[PDB]
Short mmCIF file of C-alpha atoms in Angstrom, two decimals:
data_model
loop_
_atom_site.label_atom_id
_atom_site.label_comp_id
_atom_site.label_asym_id
_atom_site.label_seq_id
_atom_site.Cartn_x
_atom_site.Cartn_y
_atom_site.Cartn_z
CA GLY A 1 0.00 0.00 0.00
CA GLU A 2 2.21 2.78 1.30
CA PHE A 3 5.84 3.35 0.37
CA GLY A 4 8.74 4.80 2.29
CA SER A 5 11.38 7.32 1.20
CA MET A 6 9.78 10.55 0.00
CA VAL A 7 12.92 11.21 -1.98
CA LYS A 8 12.90 9.16 -5.16
CA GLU A 9 16.43 8.46 -6.33
CA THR A 10 17.72 5.90 -8.81
CA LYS A 11 14.24 4.38 -9.30
CA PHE A 12 13.95 5.64 -12.85
CA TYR A 13 17.52 4.66 -13.55
CA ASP A 14 16.86 1.18 -12.13
CA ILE A 15 13.66 0.89 -14.09
CA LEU A 16 15.42 1.75 -17.37
CA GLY A 17 18.35 -0.42 -16.41
CA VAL A 18 20.86 2.40 -16.42
CA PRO A 19 23.29 3.71 -13.76
CA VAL A 20 22.64 6.92 -11.86
CA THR A 21 25.71 8.19 -13.71
CA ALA A 22 24.03 7.18 -17.01
CA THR A 23 24.62 9.08 -20.20
CA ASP A 24 22.00 9.95 -22.85
CA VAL A 25 23.05 6.97 -25.00
CA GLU A 26 22.65 4.54 -22.10
CA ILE A 27 19.35 6.17 -21.34
CA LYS A 28 18.16 5.88 -24.96
CA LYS A 29 19.06 2.20 -25.29
CA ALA A 30 17.56 1.40 -21.93
CA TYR A 31 14.39 3.04 -23.07
CA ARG A 32 14.61 1.17 -26.33
CA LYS A 33 15.08 -2.15 -24.66
CA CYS A 34 12.54 -1.55 -21.91
CA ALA A 35 9.88 -0.39 -24.36
CA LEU A 36 10.63 -3.04 -26.98
CA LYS A 37 10.93 -5.84 -24.43
CA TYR A 38 7.68 -5.06 -22.53
CA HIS A 39 5.56 -2.94 -24.91
CA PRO A 40 1.78 -3.68 -24.56
CA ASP A 41 1.33 -4.33 -28.30
CA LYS A 42 3.32 -7.56 -27.95
CA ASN A 43 3.47 -8.02 -24.22
CA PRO A 44 -0.11 -8.29 -22.89
CA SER A 45 0.85 -8.16 -19.22
CA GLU A 46 -0.29 -5.20 -17.24
CA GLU A 47 3.08 -5.07 -15.53
CA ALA A 48 4.82 -5.02 -18.87
CA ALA A 49 2.71 -2.07 -19.78
CA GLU A 50 3.54 -0.49 -16.42
CA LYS A 51 7.18 -0.92 -17.24
CA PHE A 52 6.60 0.73 -20.57
CA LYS A 53 4.87 3.72 -18.93
CA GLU A 54 7.54 4.07 -16.28
CA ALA A 55 10.19 3.73 -18.95
CA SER A 56 8.61 6.52 -20.95
CA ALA A 57 8.50 8.86 -17.91
CA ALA A 58 12.05 7.92 -17.02
CA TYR A 59 12.89 8.67 -20.59
CA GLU A 60 11.11 12.02 -20.61
CA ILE A 61 13.32 13.27 -17.75
CA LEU A 62 16.46 11.20 -18.14
CA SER A 63 16.63 11.73 -21.93
CA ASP A 64 17.02 15.38 -20.93
CA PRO A 65 20.29 15.99 -19.07
CA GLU A 66 18.83 19.15 -17.59
CA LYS A 67 15.81 17.30 -16.35
CA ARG A 68 18.02 14.47 -15.39
CA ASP A 69 20.05 16.75 -13.13
CA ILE A 70 16.89 18.28 -11.83
CA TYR A 71 15.57 14.81 -10.98
CA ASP A 72 18.95 13.78 -9.58
CA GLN A 73 19.29 16.68 -7.14
CA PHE A 74 15.64 17.27 -6.20
CA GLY A 75 14.97 13.57 -5.90
#
């Protein structure tokens, strides 16, 4: 139900499968693999779809170094 740690660090990196110190390329490929591997159009699982959605959000911030730093520091 409830989750601890208000500060969210590394979760998006972990979800994509990239290090905290990840670069844009690592981020892109992680997105590519996460989306391709668990996309809902081939992977019917809800969780797979969840992974896709999380991957896309991770991508939207992480694929942007500025956003990435913003995420990294603000947590």
